Amino acid sequence: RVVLIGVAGDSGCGKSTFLRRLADLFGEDFMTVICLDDYHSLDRKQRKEMGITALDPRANNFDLMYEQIKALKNGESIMKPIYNHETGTIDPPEKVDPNHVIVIEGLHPLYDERVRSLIDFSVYLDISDDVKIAWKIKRDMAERGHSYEDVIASINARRPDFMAYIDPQKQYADVVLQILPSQLAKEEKVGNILRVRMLQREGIPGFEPVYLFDEGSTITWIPCGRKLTCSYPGIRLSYGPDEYYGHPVSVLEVDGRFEKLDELIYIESHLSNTSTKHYGEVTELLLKHRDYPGSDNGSGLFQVLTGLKMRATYERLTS
Amino acid sequence: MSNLEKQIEQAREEAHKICDTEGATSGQCAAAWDALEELQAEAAHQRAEQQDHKTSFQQYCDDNPDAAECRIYDD
Amino acid sequence: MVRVAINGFGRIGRNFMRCWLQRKANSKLEIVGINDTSDPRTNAHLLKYDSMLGIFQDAEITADDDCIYAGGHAVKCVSDRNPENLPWSAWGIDLVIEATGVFTSREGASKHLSAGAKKVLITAPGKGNIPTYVVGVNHHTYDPSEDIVSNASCTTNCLAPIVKVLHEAFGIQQGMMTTTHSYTGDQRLLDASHRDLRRARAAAMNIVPTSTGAAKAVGLVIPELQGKLNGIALRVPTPNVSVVDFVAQVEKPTIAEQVNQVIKEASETTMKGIIHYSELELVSSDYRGHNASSILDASLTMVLGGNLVKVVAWYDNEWGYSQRVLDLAEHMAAHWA
Amino acid sequence: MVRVAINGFGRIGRNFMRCWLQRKANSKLEIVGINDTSDPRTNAHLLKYDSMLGIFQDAEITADDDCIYAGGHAVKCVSDRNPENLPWSAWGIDLVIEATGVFTSREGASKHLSAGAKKVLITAPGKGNIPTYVVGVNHHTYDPSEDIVSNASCTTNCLAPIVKVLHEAFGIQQGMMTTTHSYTGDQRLLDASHRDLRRARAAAMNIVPTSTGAAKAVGLVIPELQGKLNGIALRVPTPNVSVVDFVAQVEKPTIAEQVNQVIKEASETTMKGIIHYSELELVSSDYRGHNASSILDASLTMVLGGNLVKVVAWYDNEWGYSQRVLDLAEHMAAHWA
Amino acid sequence: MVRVAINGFGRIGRNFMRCWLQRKANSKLEIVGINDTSDPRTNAHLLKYDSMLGIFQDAEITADDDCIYAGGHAVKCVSDRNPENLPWSAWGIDLVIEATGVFTSREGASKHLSAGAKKVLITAPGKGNIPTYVVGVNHHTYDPSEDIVSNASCTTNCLAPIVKVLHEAFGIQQGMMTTTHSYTGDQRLLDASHRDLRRARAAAMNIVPTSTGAAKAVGLVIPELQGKLNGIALRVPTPNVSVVDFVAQVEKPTIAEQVNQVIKEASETTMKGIIHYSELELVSSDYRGHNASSILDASLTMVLGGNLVKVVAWYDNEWGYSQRVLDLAEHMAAHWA
Ligand SMILES: NC(=O)c1ccc[n+]([C@@H]2O[C@H](COP(=O)([O-])OP(=O)(O)OC[C@H]3O[C@@H](n4cnc5c(N)ncnc54)[C@H](O)[C@@H]3O)[C@@H](O)[C@H]2O)c1
Ligand SMILES: NC(=O)c1ccc[n+]([C@@H]2O[C@H](COP(=O)([O-])OP(=O)(O)OC[C@H]3O[C@@H](n4cnc5c(N)ncnc54)[C@H](O)[C@@H]3O)[C@@H](O)[C@H]2O)c1
Ligand SMILES: NC(=O)c1ccc[n+]([C@@H]2O[C@H](COP(=O)([O-])OP(=O)(O)OC[C@H]3O[C@@H](n4cnc5c(N)ncnc54)[C@H](O)[C@@H]3O)[C@@H](O)[C@H]2O)c1
């Protein structure tokens, strides 16, 4: 069989740690990675000539990617082209073979509707603009390129078509992870502690939600107290039924910074329908890689929760 | 890096020029800043791979694995 | 008759050659090529005078710089570290026996397939989804178009028949193991620089522990137990033979005598030639050169609470593992496609 | 100040003497009598030049045929195999330290009590209902009228604090152990005649297995786990230090990191000086002379299925066991009755 | 103060570093550079936890990927097998200590001189006419423009002071030696492929003999005995220390007591700190870490026919040889030109 997983976000294709957590979960033996900048129509020269970004529905051969994607189901080794990233040009293609798990990730994994009918499980990954700025400050600060504070003006110039081109895809994804500045902590820089939330969608079977103590009644839980000595500022979870874009969703939400072990196992003991064959398996998957960015906050929690639901969908698809 | 090291500053000069001259809010200089951000993204991809520069073992065991320094009979 | 080859004339290669010299008449295999990083003068001496199995006695060993005459039988020999420059199609090689401990990947081992060999049997737990097969458990269920097959480690090759018997008779929920392993060639003799720190220390002096995934390879060769078997290894200063402890958590309750009875009759019906059963109070060095891939030690089997069993198994990781390699090679010769 | 004596100046006796020479100032114990089957000229040499702990350095060792001068401090010394002909009341002996491995019975050890000694601390798992006490578990709960007390074996003395911590934190249903043990003096060097057959074989050559009841002694020192703990031992050719594997079946489920956290904080609150916690990739010989009675090896702790835990513990059965003997002796000196 | 470097951080390098950490205050030498084929994280661990000399205790050892902090003292560290790409003039290196066992030729060792180092002291008997110097025999007679100097082997470094004393006191016609040598890192652990066949066999199992010319190196460091001294070596399974037998044919006749008297007074007048004299019945492991480069064993010295003498000398080929290397390095620092 062929299963398929759609990831959506502008974190750079193969440049986000969610794929790394999926690699720790499945293994690169069982899955292969497909970037989606490879199906660009023409180059950055023709982007400058046509005056167009890399976000245009003109800018990709959306039909040949569909033909290779449908041929992925039939077992044959696909021949996919490669965007030469340094030059902006296009490599003559590479013949790669299908695997047990196939992923699809790029700026438009979901813009096509026939592949939206093809993708077995979908993830959009949203980022608020504040932590965009806080990540670009780290981007041009660690490199010391000295290109800051007009990239601020690049943000809002990149903004308007992006909301037209990309953001209506989240109206069709299953799970969407938003990352916000933390309301809890104020006297830091604006990107230390994240306020993350995984708006997951009901409906489509196999995918359960992961509900905190009750399906469908908003519950804001702080695990500090008689059995956990919370540091500053500690965790503040949330939950809530909601209808996002007129669709039955269930936001599960975490604010805070995981400082130690027991506060991360105590949270995991109380989530429900998390689909583990193993007690504390989510905590083990958190602490197999202490060095990954975002393990100390809820981003690494939610990414591995989504990947664990991907295990659930894979077990549903392969019996 | 020297080539993209120059090209990022060249596209930065163009970002100062084309989006002050030929329209600050249109598709042309949005394509220009999109290009410069992709150049920055490939600088990031170069940066992370040079952070993952191995010192010796994934070189000397890359080319000659069976030396006594990195035989692993994972048995 | 199948023309076979040996990549890496080390411990496993010398034992493979010695086994084929002791099982010559019943063989569809003719060993025609070896390659080591040594000249052909040295490794013939190392074949004849093994400091573990004594002096070889049955056939005469001699060599010159291009061939090796073992008992009148000639065998070719070459030396190269690149697998791509090797005369395989020039020698007519169906099956090459990867035993260098280097080419564990599919892309590494497939270099011989590219260079002109038809099938490769690698004597290591390979990285990536290489089809693994253990004689006595699932040596039947290989597809003969699978040209790149892998025998597992010696610990897995010992442990998996016992786990098969106990899973069929009782059913296994979970299971640990802790093999007290003889020291292998990877460890440095004195404290020298090494990629892993616990193998960097002295071998003759120390119980060095190591983490292995070779317990999980039972979950490959038995599919319904994957993710349920894990264990560590202890390397102690004995040169040849080793013992494996195995703690399983069965669910059908029983006593210590009954599991011994089950394995004793399984030694005589199905696992004959794989599992030997010994009710003697032997020690380690009485298993140098034993033909079975697991000798169950009877007096130490114990059950606590009905649902928690411990067995221990002697096994020779240099001779019995070579025997299982040669049996798998003959069994793939008997179903050549 | 308590005048103490040593029966049998073997490995445990020499290590006890060396420990008291290194812990002299804080001691309510003064060692005034020893007896070995050797003359006083030889065992002073064996005290000074230990081929395991090197040459002793701090104090001067000399002897003549009636006394031994250790650092200016005189100690008496005699030689007799009959415990009934021994000058105990002539020397004023409160506590004698039985370390011959001979007098394990109550009736054997009570011969010193009859011959004029007040209390006896035997460094062996004694036959019969002798009250056993481990420092760090139940060294408080001895009645001071119990004059015949027993420290358990070194394996039990290592294993029982870990089992105490895991039983308090998680609760234990069942538990196995398999200690990879250094070779002791009881084994014959070459293959010589011996009462047990698996100890009759060569020590430097072999992994010899043996059955021990020293796992059950945890069920003595922890009463609610008796009949639930059992295990075997493996003697491998390392001279000094050893490691113990321990498989428990807990009932409160957890992961591998949490048990390491529990034992790490128990190393710093209650078991301080008993259990050391090491997150290094050390090997065996880096624990020669460590003061703790169990070094938990952190990187090898594993949990399968939530309710099945495995730890391994390095421990020195010649130095740390002597340290616990001397700590128990001082702790019975502090509550002399 | 002389900035010095270490090529090859093996046994001799780790012992050299440990000796300099124990002789820091009286040193004109500051160790500023090392290079091994390992990363700087591993060899700091191997420096701190030596499985032969125990855990280092006096100073703290830590590292990151570019430097090593030994007791607060920083030292640089790099990794390259080509000696020509090494930052010597970038680091200001007067003396580099060749200890890889690779660069024994003049043209090999002179690569460091070309690459920007001022003097090289190689810890091996070098091929070709490299000026060799032994501390205690002819450490005075070096010309300070000789930038490429060689210390001899450990066997020669032990044997030559005894031969100097016996040649001055009695006069030597001929002389044999047979050193019972501890196993070194060159031998393969199991029977693996090796350039010389007698080193190809197992080290922990075997007395392997080998032919050495290190007896003839005494004829280099003592010129009037060249071509008169020859001997073999026996590698036995002891890890650290070794003993050398020495049969000389003197011409001035004497008895066994008189040669002991001569060497005893030479231990107290001229060879002080080189030759220790021991009238104890010690054994091998009581010389792990001894500072002298030869401990003469007194009870075994014998003379047959007046003109035929045999001595035996304990010596540590990993610690005392490092001590003589560091003494030669300081002695060339004291006469820097
Ligand atoms: N040692 C055991 O008892 C045992 C048991 C089961 C499995 N194995 C596996 O068997 C393999 C080999 O074991 P071994 O003890 O024979 O190893 P070894 O290192 O003792 O011998 C391997 C031989 O192959 C040679 N070699 C290495 N790389 C080579 C190359 N690229 N080209 C040519 N020759 C090369 C080596 O120089 C040596 O001659 C390893 O995968 C090991 O894990 C070993
Ligand atoms: N060996 C260890 O590391 C270790 C660890 C824990 C406990 N123990 C226990 O310690 C005891 C002794 O161990 P050991 O290694 O010192 O033993 P050992 O045999 O090495 O030394 C015992 C000494 O006592 C002497 N002796 C024996 N019987 C005697 C008698 N009747 N009268 C006088 N002297 C007598 C022996 O000759 C020898 O000198 C045994 O019970 C052993 O199980 C040993
Ligand atoms: N082993 C002894 O006790 C002893 C005694 C006297 C003299 N020696 C001589 O000392 C030398 C080294 O002895 P050892 O036991 O330390 O050897 P070793 O092999 O144990 O250690 C040598 C170290 O140097 C490294 N090395 C080798 N070639 C290198 C290169 N080209 N560049 C960088 N690093 C390199 C090795 O990988 C290892 O880290 C040999 O000449 C030996 O004969 C040894």
Side-chain angles (χ1 to χ4, degrees), chain A residues 1-27 29-45 47-68 70-96 98-170 172-242 244-258 260-295 297-319, chain B, chain C, chain D, chain E:
Chain A
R1 294 179 64 91
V2 175
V3 305
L4 189 59
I5 292 168
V7 179
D10 60 351
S11 177
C13 70
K15 297 184 182 182
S16 177
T17 188
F18 171 67
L19 305 173
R20 277 76 175 268
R21 296 188 185 277
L22 288 172
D24 189 78
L25 184 59
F26 287 157
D29 49 353
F30 290 100
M31 76 175 185
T32 60
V33 177
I34 299 172
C35 172
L36 264 290
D37 287 333
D38 55 347
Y39 289 106
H40 291 163
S41 65
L42 278 80
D43 55 352
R44 303 180 298 185
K45 190 262 181 182
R47 291 174 190 173
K48 191 65 61 62
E49 182 176 359
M50 298 301 289
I52 193 63
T53 72
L55 285 77
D56 197 359
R58 295 179 65 192
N60 296 314
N61 196 0
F62 288 101
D63 297 331
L64 184 56
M65 68 173 79
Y66 179 70
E67 297 298 322
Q68 290 184 358
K70 187 184 285 293
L72 279 167
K73 185 176 286 294
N74 298 317
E76 69 97 27
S77 179
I78 56 167
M79 184 70 188
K80 60 102 171 180
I82 287 95
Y83 181 80
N84 192 2
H85 288 82
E86 194 272 333
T87 64
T89 60
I90 297 168
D91 193 13
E94 283 175 350
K95 182 70 67 65
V96 294
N99 198 351
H100 295 286
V101 176
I102 304 300
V103 312
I104 287 177
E105 55 90 18
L107 289 179
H108 301 82
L110 196 60
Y111 183 73
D112 290 331
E113 290 81 6
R114 52 182 75 93
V115 78
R116 189 179 72 190
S117 301
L118 186 63
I119 289 172
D120 301 329
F121 181 74
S122 60
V123 168
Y124 182 77
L125 197 144
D126 198 0
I127 298 97
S128 68
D129 54 352
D130 292 330
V131 67
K132 292 184 183 68
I133 295 168
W135 284 356
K136 294 297 182 182
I137 287 172
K138 185 61 68 177
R139 180 68 56 83
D140 292 332
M141 182 64 71
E143 291 181 351
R144 292 175 182 173
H146 188 274
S147 299
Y148 65 98
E149 80 187 358
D150 200 3
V151 291
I152 299 176
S154 78
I155 290 302
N156 44 0
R158 190 182 175 187
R159 178 70 178 272
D161 48 352
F162 177 79
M163 301 186 291
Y165 290 155
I166 305 298
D167 292 336
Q169 290 181 355
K170 78 191 290 183
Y172 298 99
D174 293 327
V175 181
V176 42
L177 281 74
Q178 292 185 357
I179 299 169
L180 291 171
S182 288
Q183 187 271 332
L184 183 59
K186 302 282 101 175
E187 191 183 1
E188 292 298 324
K189 68 180 70 63
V190 80
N192 288 325
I193 304 168
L194 303 177
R195 180 176 183 267
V196 293
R197 52 187 293 166
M198 43 171 288
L199 285 77
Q200 59 191 357
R201 185 175 179 177
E202 293 180 352
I204 295 169
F207 181 79
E208 296 291 326
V210 280
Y211 66 98
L212 180 60
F213 287 154
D214 181 77
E215 290 181 350
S217 66
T218 170
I219 165 178
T220 69
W221 173 48
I222 297 168
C224 300
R226 299 293 178 186
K227 294 180 70 66
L228 289 177
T229 64
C230 287
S231 64
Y232 182 76
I235 313 295
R236 179 179 295 169
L237 273 84
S238 171
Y239 180 80
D242 198 356
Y244 187 76
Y245 287 171
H247 298 291
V249 298
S250 300
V251 52
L252 175 59
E253 180 174 1
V254 167
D255 194 3
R257 179 180 296 276
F258 301 105
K260 56 178 73 175
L261 171 67
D262 53 356
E263 293 184 358
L264 200 142
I265 183 61
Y266 187 76
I267 293 174
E268 197 272 332
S269 70
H270 293 167
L271 273 75
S272 58
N273 280 322
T274 185
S275 180
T276 59
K277 293 190 286 186
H278 189 194
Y279 178 78
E281 184 176 1
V282 182
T283 60
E284 293 180 359
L285 290 169
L286 257 295
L287 292 173
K288 282 173 73 174
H289 300 281
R290 297 178 64 187
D291 56 349
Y292 281 175
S295 68
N297 55 12
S299 61
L301 179 57
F302 286 169
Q303 287 169 354
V304 76
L305 281 169
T306 53
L308 189 55
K309 299 303 290 183
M310 291 179 186
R311 289 182 72 244
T313 59
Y314 181 76
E315 185 64 32
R316 196 264 300 161
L317 280 165
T318 61
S319 69
Chain B
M1 182 187 287
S2 298
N3 295 318
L4 188 57
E5 180 71 26
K6 290 183 179 181
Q7 288 176 356
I8 288 171
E9 295 181 354
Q10 289 179 355
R12 187 181 178 182
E13 293 175 355
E14 188 181 3
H16 292 87
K17 186 180 262 78
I18 198 169
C19 201
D20 291 335
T21 304
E22 288 87 5
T25 57
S26 181
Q28 285 75 244
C29 74
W33 290 104
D34 181 73
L36 180 58
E37 195 271 331
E38 292 296 321
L39 269 70
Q40 187 64 256
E42 297 297 324
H45 183 73
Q46 183 66 40
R47 185 70 182 91
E49 297 297 323
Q50 295 298 321
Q51 279 303 113
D52 287 333
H53 194 194
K54 82 281 288 179
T55 59
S56 295
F57 278 165
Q58 199 188 5
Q59 288 290 316
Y60 182 69
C61 303
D62 191 71
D63 59 358
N64 207 172
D66 58 337
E69 286 80 3
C70 53
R71 296 188 183 100
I72 286 293
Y73 295 159
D74 195 3
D75 297 334
Chain C
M1 295 301 289
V2 178
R3 296 174 64 85
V4 295
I6 294 168
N7 189 6
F9 196 64
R11 296 293 291 162
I12 309 298
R14 281 184 294 276
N15 287 321
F16 187 77
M17 183 63 203
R18 188 183 293 265
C19 287
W20 179 69
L21 288 175
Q22 292 184 357
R23 292 176 64 184
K24 188 184 286 185
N26 300 322
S27 176
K28 296 177 288 295
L29 302 176
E30 58 275 18
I31 294 178
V32 294
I34 60 170
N35 48 354
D36 196 82
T37 65
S38 67
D39 50 351
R41 300 295 299 273
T42 304
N43 46 9
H45 169 77
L46 285 175
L47 180 61
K48 182 178 177 183
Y49 299 101
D50 195 3
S51 175
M52 194 62 64
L53 305 178
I55 302 167
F56 186 71
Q57 296 295 320
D58 182 73
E60 294 296 324
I61 304 301
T62 183
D64 50 354
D65 50 353
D66 52 355
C67 293
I68 297 168
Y69 296 97
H73 180 77
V75 62
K76 291 181 180 179
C77 50
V78 76
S79 295
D80 191 2
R81 293 183 179 273
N82 189 1
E84 292 177 353
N85 293 321
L86 290 176
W88 301 119
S89 66
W91 291 355
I93 307 303
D94 292 331
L95 176 64
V96 68
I97 300 299
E98 176 65 30
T100 63
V102 184
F103 292 159
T104 64
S105 175
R106 183 182 295 275
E107 65 186 5
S110 64
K111 295 182 180 181
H112 296 280
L113 295 173
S114 67
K118 291 183 180 179
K119 291 186 182 293
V120 54
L121 191 146
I122 178 167
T123 63
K127 288 184 180 293
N129 295 319
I130 300 171
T132 175
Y133 299 103
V134 176
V135 173
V137 176
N138 53 3
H139 69 281
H140 298 288
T141 65
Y142 71 103
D143 183 73
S145 175
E146 298 295 326
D147 48 356
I148 176 171
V149 297
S150 69
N151 191 355
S153 173
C154 56
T155 73
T156 303
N157 200 354
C158 172
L159 183 59
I162 297 297
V163 182
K164 181 175 179 179
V165 172
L166 295 175
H167 181 75
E168 291 175 353
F170 298 99
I172 296 171
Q173 298 184 1
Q174 299 301 316
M176 294 291 180
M177 57 90 72
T178 300
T179 170
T180 300
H181 198 71
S182 65
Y183 55 86
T184 55
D186 51 353
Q187 299 181 0
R188 303 302 300 270
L189 176 60
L190 294 177
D191 298 333
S193 65
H194 186 270
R195 185 170 71 190
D196 192 2
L197 283 73
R198 285 182 177 175
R199 297 186 182 183
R201 312 294 295 273
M205 294 291 288
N206 304 323
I207 296 168
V208 297
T210 182
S211 66
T212 183
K216 291 181 182 178
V218 185
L220 298 182
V221 300
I222 290 175
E224 66 272 18
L225 297 175
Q226 195 270 331
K228 293 178 179 179
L229 296 173
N230 195 1
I232 67 170
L234 297 175
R235 309 282 190 92
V236 298
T238 60
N240 197 7
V241 77
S242 65
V243 72
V244 51
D245 179 73
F246 178 69
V247 177
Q249 184 179 359
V250 294
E251 57 187 0
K252 182 177 178 181
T254 181
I255 60 168
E257 185 71 29
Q258 185 179 2
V259 294
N260 292 322
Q261 179 63 39
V262 169
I263 299 168
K264 185 179 184 295
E265 62 186 0
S267 70
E268 295 178 354
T269 60
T270 63
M271 301 297 173
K272 188 182 295 296
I274 300 299
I275 295 169
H276 186 76
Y277 183 72
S278 294
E279 289 183 354
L280 303 173
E281 283 181 350
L282 295 178
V283 296
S284 76
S285 173
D286 303 340
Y287 302 109
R288 294 180 299 175
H290 203 280
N291 285 316
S293 176
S294 292
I295 291 96
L296 179 69
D297 200 1
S299 297
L300 300 175
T301 307
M302 60 176 67
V303 172
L304 288 178
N307 54 358
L308 181 61
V309 66
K310 171 183 283 188
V311 296
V312 290
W314 299 102
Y315 67 107
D316 193 357
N317 57 11
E318 289 181 349
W319 181 255
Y321 182 75
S322 170
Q323 288 293 325
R324 304 287 81 78
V325 167
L326 188 140
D327 291 335
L328 187 61
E330 285 185 351
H331 189 80
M332 293 188 74
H335 302 287
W336 179 259
Chain D
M1 295 301 289
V2 178
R3 296 174 64 85
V4 295
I6 294 168
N7 189 6
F9 196 64
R11 296 294 291 162
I12 309 298
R14 281 184 294 276
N15 287 321
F16 187 77
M17 183 63 203
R18 188 183 293 265
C19 287
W20 179 69
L21 288 175
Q22 292 184 357
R23 292 176 64 184
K24 188 184 286 185
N26 300 322
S27 176
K28 296 177 288 295
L29 302 176
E30 58 275 18
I31 294 178
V32 294
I34 60 170
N35 48 354
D36 196 82
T37 65
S38 67
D39 50 351
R41 300 294 299 273
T42 304
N43 46 9
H45 169 77
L46 285 175
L47 180 61
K48 182 178 177 183
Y49 299 101
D50 195 3
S51 175
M52 194 62 64
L53 305 178
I55 302 167
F56 186 71
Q57 295 295 320
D58 182 73
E60 294 297 324
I61 304 301
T62 182
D64 50 354
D65 50 353
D66 52 355
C67 293
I68 297 168
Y69 296 97
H73 180 77
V75 62
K76 291 181 180 179
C77 50
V78 76
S79 295
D80 191 2
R81 293 183 179 273
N82 190 1
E84 292 177 353
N85 293 321
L86 291 176
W88 302 119
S89 66
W91 291 355
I93 307 303
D94 292 331
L95 176 64
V96 68
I97 300 299
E98 176 65 30
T100 63
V102 184
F103 292 159
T104 64
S105 175
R106 183 182 295 275
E107 65 186 5
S110 64
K111 295 182 180 181
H112 296 280
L113 295 173
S114 67
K118 291 183 180 179
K119 291 186 182 293
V120 54
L121 191 147
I122 178 167
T123 63
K127 288 184 180 293
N129 295 319
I130 300 171
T132 175
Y133 299 103
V134 176
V135 173
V137 176
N138 53 3
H139 69 281
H140 298 288
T141 65
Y142 71 103
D143 183 73
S145 175
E146 298 296 326
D147 48 356
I148 176 171
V149 297
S150 69
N151 191 355
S153 173
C154 56
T155 73
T156 303
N157 200 354
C158 172
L159 183 59
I162 297 297
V163 182
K164 181 175 179 179
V165 172
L166 295 175
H167 181 75
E168 291 175 353
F170 298 99
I172 296 171
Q173 298 184 1
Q174 299 301 316
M176 294 291 180
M177 57 90 72
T178 300
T179 170
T180 300
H181 198 71
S182 65
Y183 55 86
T184 55
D186 51 354
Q187 299 181 0
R188 303 302 300 270
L189 176 60
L190 294 177
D191 298 333
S193 65
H194 186 270
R195 186 170 71 190
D196 192 2
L197 283 73
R198 285 182 177 175
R199 297 186 182 183
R201 312 294 295 273
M205 294 291 288
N206 304 323
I207 296 168
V208 297
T210 182
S211 66
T212 183
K216 291 181 182 178
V218 185
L220 298 182
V221 300
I222 290 175
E224 66 272 18
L225 297 175
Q226 195 270 331
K228 293 178 179 179
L229 296 173
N230 195 1
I232 67 170
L234 297 175
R235 309 282 190 92
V236 298
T238 60
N240 197 7
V241 77
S242 65
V243 72
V244 51
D245 179 73
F246 179 69
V247 177
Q249 184 179 359
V250 294
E251 57 187 0
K252 182 177 178 181
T254 181
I255 60 168
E257 185 71 29
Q258 185 179 2
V259 294
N260 292 322
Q261 179 63 39
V262 169
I263 299 168
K264 185 179 184 295
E265 62 186 0
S267 70
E268 295 178 354
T269 60
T270 63
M271 301 297 173
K272 188 182 295 296
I274 300 299
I275 295 169
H276 186 76
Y277 183 72
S278 294
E279 289 183 354
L280 303 173
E281 283 181 350
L282 295 178
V283 296
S284 76
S285 173
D286 303 340
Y287 302 109
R288 294 180 299 175
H290 203 280
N291 286 316
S293 176
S294 292
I295 291 96
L296 179 69
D297 200 1
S299 297
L300 300 176
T301 307
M302 60 176 67
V303 172
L304 288 178
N307 54 358
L308 181 61
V309 66
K310 171 183 283 188
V311 296
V312 290
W314 299 102
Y315 68 106
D316 193 357
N317 57 11
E318 289 181 349
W319 181 255
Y321 182 75
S322 170
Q323 288 293 325
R324 304 287 81 78
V325 167
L326 188 140
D327 291 334
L328 187 61
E330 285 185 351
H331 189 80
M332 293 188 74
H335 302 287
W336 179 259
Chain E
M1 295 300 289
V2 178
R3 296 174 64 85
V4 295
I6 294 168
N7 189 6
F9 196 64
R11 296 293 291 162
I12 309 298
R14 281 184 294 276
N15 287 321
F16 187 77
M17 183 63 203
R18 188 183 293 265
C19 287
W20 179 69
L21 288 175
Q22 292 184 357
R23 292 176 64 184
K24 188 184 286 185
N26 300 322
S27 176
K28 296 177 288 295
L29 302 176
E30 58 275 18
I31 294 178
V32 294
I34 60 170
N35 48 353
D36 196 82
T37 65
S38 67
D39 50 351
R41 300 294 299 273
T42 304
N43 46 9
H45 169 77
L46 285 175
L47 180 61
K48 182 178 177 183
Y49 299 101
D50 195 3
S51 175
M52 194 62 64
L53 305 178
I55 302 167
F56 186 71
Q57 295 295 320
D58 182 73
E60 294 297 324
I61 304 301
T62 182
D64 50 354
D65 50 353
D66 52 355
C67 293
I68 297 168
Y69 296 97
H73 180 77
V75 62
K76 291 181 180 179
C77 50
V78 76
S79 295
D80 191 2
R81 293 183 180 273
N82 190 1
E84 292 177 353
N85 293 321
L86 290 176
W88 302 119
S89 66
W91 291 355
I93 307 303
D94 292 331
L95 176 64
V96 68
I97 300 299
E98 176 65 30
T100 63
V102 184
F103 292 159
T104 64
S105 175
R106 183 182 295 275
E107 65 186 5
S110 64
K111 295 182 180 181
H112 296 280
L113 295 173
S114 67
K118 291 183 180 179
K119 291 186 182 293
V120 54
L121 191 147
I122 178 167
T123 63
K127 288 184 180 293
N129 295 319
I130 300 171
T132 175
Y133 299 103
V134 176
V135 173
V137 176
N138 53 3
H139 69 281
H140 298 288
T141 65
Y142 71 103
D143 183 73
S145 175
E146 298 296 326
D147 48 356
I148 176 171
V149 297
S150 69
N151 191 355
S153 173
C154 56
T155 72
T156 303
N157 200 354
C158 172
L159 183 59
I162 297 297
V163 182
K164 181 175 179 179
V165 172
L166 295 175
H167 181 75
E168 291 175 353
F170 298 99
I172 296 171
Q173 298 184 1
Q174 299 301 316
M176 294 291 180
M177 58 90 72
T178 300
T179 170
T180 300
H181 198 71
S182 65
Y183 55 86
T184 55
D186 51 354
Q187 299 181 0
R188 303 302 300 270
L189 176 60
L190 294 177
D191 298 333
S193 65
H194 186 270
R195 186 170 71 190
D196 193 2
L197 283 73
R198 285 182 177 175
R199 297 186 182 183
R201 312 294 295 273
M205 294 291 288
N206 304 323
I207 296 168
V208 297
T210 182
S211 66
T212 182
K216 291 181 182 178
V218 185
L220 297 182
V221 300
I222 290 175
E224 66 272 18
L225 297 175
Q226 195 270 332
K228 293 178 179 179
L229 296 173
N230 195 1
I232 67 170
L234 297 175
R235 309 282 190 92
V236 298
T238 60
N240 197 7
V241 77
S242 65
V243 72
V244 51
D245 179 73
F246 178 69
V247 177
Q249 184 179 359
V250 294
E251 57 187 0
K252 182 177 178 181
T254 181
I255 60 168
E257 185 71 29
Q258 185 179 2
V259 294
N260 292 322
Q261 179 63 39
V262 169
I263 299 168
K264 185 179 184 295
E265 62 186 0
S267 70
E268 295 178 354
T269 60
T270 63
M271 301 297 173
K272 188 182 295 296
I274 300 299
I275 295 169
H276 186 76
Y277 183 72
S278 294
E279 289 183 354
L280 303 173
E281 283 181 350
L282 295 178
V283 296
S284 76
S285 173
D286 303 340
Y287 302 109
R288 294 180 299 176
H290 203 280
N291 286 316
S293 176
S294 292
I295 291 96
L296 179 69
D297 200 1
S299 297
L300 300 175
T301 307
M302 60 176 67
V303 172
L304 288 178
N307 54 358
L308 181 61
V309 66
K310 171 183 283 188
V311 296
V312 290
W314 299 102
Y315 68 106
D316 193 357
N317 57 11
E318 289 181 349
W319 181 255
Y321 182 75
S322 170
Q323 288 293 325
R324 304 287 81 78
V325 167
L326 188 140
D327 291 334
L328 187 61
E330 285 185 351
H331 189 80
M332 293 188 74
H335 302 287
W336 179 259

